[PDB]
Design a protein around this ligand. Sequence first.
Ligand SMILES: [K+]
Ligand SMILES: [Mg+2]
Ligand SMILES: [Mg+2]
Ligand SMILES: [Mg+2]
Ligand SMILES: [Mg+2]
Ligand SMILES: [Mg+2]
Ligand SMILES: [Mg+2]
Ligand SMILES: [Mg+2]
Ligand SMILES: [Mg+2]
Ligand SMILES: [Mg+2]
Ligand SMILES: [Mg+2]
Ligand SMILES: [Mg+2]
Ligand SMILES: [Mg+2]
Ligand SMILES: [Mg+2]
Ligand SMILES: [Mg+2]
Ligand SMILES: [Mg+2]
Ligand SMILES: [Mg+2]
Ligand SMILES: [Mg+2]
Ligand SMILES: [Mg+2]
Ligand SMILES: [Mg+2]
Ligand SMILES: [Mg+2]
Ligand SMILES: [Mg+2]
Ligand SMILES: [Mg+2]
Ligand SMILES: [Mg+2]
Length: 484
Amino acid sequence: HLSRPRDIVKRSTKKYLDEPLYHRLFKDGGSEVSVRQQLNQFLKGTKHVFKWEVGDTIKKLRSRGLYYPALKLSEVMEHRGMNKTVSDQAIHLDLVAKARGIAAGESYFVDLPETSKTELTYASLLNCYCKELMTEKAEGLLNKMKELNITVSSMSYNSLMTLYTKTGQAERVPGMIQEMKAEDVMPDSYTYNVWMRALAATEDVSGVERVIEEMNRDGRVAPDWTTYSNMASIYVDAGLSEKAEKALQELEMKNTDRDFKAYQFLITLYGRLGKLNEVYRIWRSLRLAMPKTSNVAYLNMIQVLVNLKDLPGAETLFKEWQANCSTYDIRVVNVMIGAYTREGLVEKANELKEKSPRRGGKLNAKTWELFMDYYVKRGETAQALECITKAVSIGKGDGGKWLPSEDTVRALMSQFEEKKDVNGAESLLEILKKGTDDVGAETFESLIRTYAAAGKSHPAMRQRLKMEKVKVDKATEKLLDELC
RNA sequence: AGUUGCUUUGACUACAAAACCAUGCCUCUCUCUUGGAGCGAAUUGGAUGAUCGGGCCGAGGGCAGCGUAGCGCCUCUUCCCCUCACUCUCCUUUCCCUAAUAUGACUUGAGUCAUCAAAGCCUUUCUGACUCAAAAAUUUUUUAAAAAAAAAAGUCGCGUAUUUUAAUAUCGCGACUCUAAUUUUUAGUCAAGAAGGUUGAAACUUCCAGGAAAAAACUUCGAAUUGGGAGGGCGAUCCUCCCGGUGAACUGACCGUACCCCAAACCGACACAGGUGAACAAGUAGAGUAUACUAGGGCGCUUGAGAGAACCAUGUCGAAGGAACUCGGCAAAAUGACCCCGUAACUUCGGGAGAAGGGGUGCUCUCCUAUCUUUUGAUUAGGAAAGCGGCACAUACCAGGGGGUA
RNA sequence: CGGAACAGGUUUUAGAACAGAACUUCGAUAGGCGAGAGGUGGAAGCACCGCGAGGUGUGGAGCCAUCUCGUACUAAACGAA
Ligand SMILES: [K+]
Ligand SMILES: [Mg+2]
Ligand SMILES: [Mg+2]
Ligand SMILES: [Mg+2]
Ligand SMILES: [Mg+2]
Ligand SMILES: [Mg+2]
Ligand SMILES: [Mg+2]
Ligand SMILES: [Mg+2]
Ligand SMILES: [Mg+2]
Ligand SMILES: [Mg+2]
Ligand SMILES: [Mg+2]
Ligand SMILES: [Mg+2]
Ligand SMILES: [Mg+2]
Ligand SMILES: [Mg+2]
Ligand SMILES: [Mg+2]
Ligand SMILES: [Mg+2]
Ligand SMILES: [Mg+2]
Ligand SMILES: [Mg+2]
Ligand SMILES: [Mg+2]
Ligand SMILES: [Mg+2]
Ligand SMILES: [Mg+2]
Ligand SMILES: [Mg+2]
Ligand SMILES: [Mg+2]
Ligand SMILES: [Mg+2]
């Protein structure tokens, strides 16, 4: 056709790729390593691509959080001769801020030419400010835009409102919506969504009934399932049930594209309400919308079923996931691991722990956290020590460090008080020392008295000055300076 | 000296949606590519009930031929297939509607904008996965010891009976497919990044005339300053080994740098048509750095206004003749490019030879060939065949006159 | 002939400068404008035929170095000099 001459089916195979780039980069999987390997193999080749092909590739790589390969492809293909326009420069600015940080994004914006510093680049930098929560520089961009008469779109106002909601100054939203209505700016559905969220955050449930009637009066915005998701979340957190069911049934009517996240929202909202029959009603629709169901829907479903106490249904779902799983997801195991430790059927939890790494799932930290929860409920402390050591050795799955909860630490130390396990208390303190540099809220401030078994340590209040100036209760130093 | 490399390579598609509350352990743990649940229809279905019609099997008495068993004719309705109502829960063929199919809705009219070390190699170094080396772990066999090995699941098939009804399981078997683990340290492979250096900046073949020097620079070894450790030491800060040994948010002094540089600034008495190394130098035509025209960059040459005599310099053209001119074809004219046909006397066999003498050359359409086409169902080069225009198709510029004989 | 002849301006059959000859506003001397002769050879636009290079018609068409005729519009006595 004359509309689209650069067709991807009829194009030459000697010059161009045999399959589209957004199909080629995802051949070996969606993993970071496989995407990087595919990009490295492609950039060394002698086959070429289209500009719209690279644009859709950038959007697909951005849509799954793959920011480094998207930035690398954009930089290399611009270096090879593909000229960025203003829109492509806005997308590249957002990609730079996503990958190398806002300090790199600011330098890219400065090094941009002057005729490229238009409303698209300004709005992209504003969004990259609000997503990184820098209120002062945000407002410094805002008054500069208002001074230079750059057209402020609804996207910028929604970005500021989401920034206000996340920072905690959520009372500014009702002033700002009337500001953007006074400045002749029509809103979108996300404007009503953040307005509703700020109104519910202001402890005002009765205000969300006058906004829905106003957008019904407007007649210009299309209501979407995200609106009803916000209504369902606000009502379920507020305890109202029938209005939440009406919102969720309207949500089910609005989900015409069979969205996986929307189905997850139905499942978790009906699970938090507690209605098992309609939970299974949406679940059968989910199995009718995707036969090869991913592990995320199982992760939601089995957690909902065990929070609604359907344990043999969860056990049959486990066998279904076993017989149809391609990746042995450890979180699926770890849901019923914590289930079997909470209801105490510990032999089957131990069997799953043994059989997971053979089938191909290595243990993360939360399984050991649930087992030390089990051991701190049943009073065995040595096995809680053996669990917390392996938990801090594994650490977090995103590169963080695992730290035990304050309530569990407090209960474990109260258990240490009775048995006079000074060695156990010292090992727990050493573990917390390795975990964190601070180590103290209630950890040892009133907990010198575990030394009241036989003698005490040497330093006499000088060790307690070492760990960054802690302060103890007034009724704690008396048995300390009695024993000197 | 000759070949091969150094010789640039791409995009043009118009696109801010990257701002999200739920569960949250890195919540898409890895989704590239799936028709619809339309209250939508037509043939078909049918989870249903009879009537009418047609059509088997069969049931008896018999007319009929035996000691049981018969061949045609004669009274029957079950049973099947239609038919008329109810009818949407499984199945076949279609049609409408929706979704999906990558965004949105003349100036490459022969251009604009980027790129201008790619590809290798060698030292480190951060982080992942795999093979593991080997040990501790559990089963069998052999005599507490020594040898080999699986652990976890799905699927097909066989024979056989336990419930208070989650019997899709249990009982023994045979086979296929799939995954790699509980603890420990070392190597090695890859993968993905960050620092340096180095090559590309030259390789190969042939030839005879046989193609600089240098404890300067570099690689190696030796010895080693003002450093830190390990074993001796009736000593004296001495012996014997190991590590470091020019390393860095140290430091890098001194001289030149203006301007002209085929020129009005240098060598020629002149602001002199002369002389003055090498490197770079877009486009169209072209074998080409020839030649014509041109953008960028630079310049308009430090005397002008008229008139358009003789004569002089320098060009264009010239009837008929064509060297009759003159010391002499002096000068001028003429030939001139690529492809094809053809090419003598003589000879030291290498040559003469581009001998001499001829023919074609533009443009359009259609075929065929290939171009080692990085947009292959149409773009470039060649050849065939048919046409079109003019006086002229090497149309301007560039560009051998030839032969005979001393 | 006696405010005569010159000079100045527009030119030319004349011409190196000079000189000669024509005209100098009650004036066709030069330019312009219009018409014709002469030269070249069939414009542009439109239409028809052909895939195309191209061909045919409107049409001895279009154009202008010169020459002649008509005409004071411009410059020559716009010298109220
Ligand atoms: K120069
Ligand atoms: Mg030396
Ligand atoms: Mg200079
Ligand atoms: Mg001079
Ligand atoms: Mg001069
Ligand atoms: Mg000179
Ligand atoms: Mg030249
Ligand atoms: Mg110029
Ligand atoms: Mg002359
Ligand atoms: Mg003549
Ligand atoms: Mg002649
Ligand atoms: Mg002749
Ligand atoms: Mg004579
Ligand atoms: Mg003679
Ligand atoms: Mg003579
Ligand atoms: Mg001559
Ligand atoms: Mg000549
Ligand atoms: Mg041809
Ligand atoms: Mg030429
Ligand atoms: Mg007079
Ligand atoms: Mg005169
Ligand atoms: Mg006249
Ligand atoms: Mg005539
Ligand atoms: Mg003409």
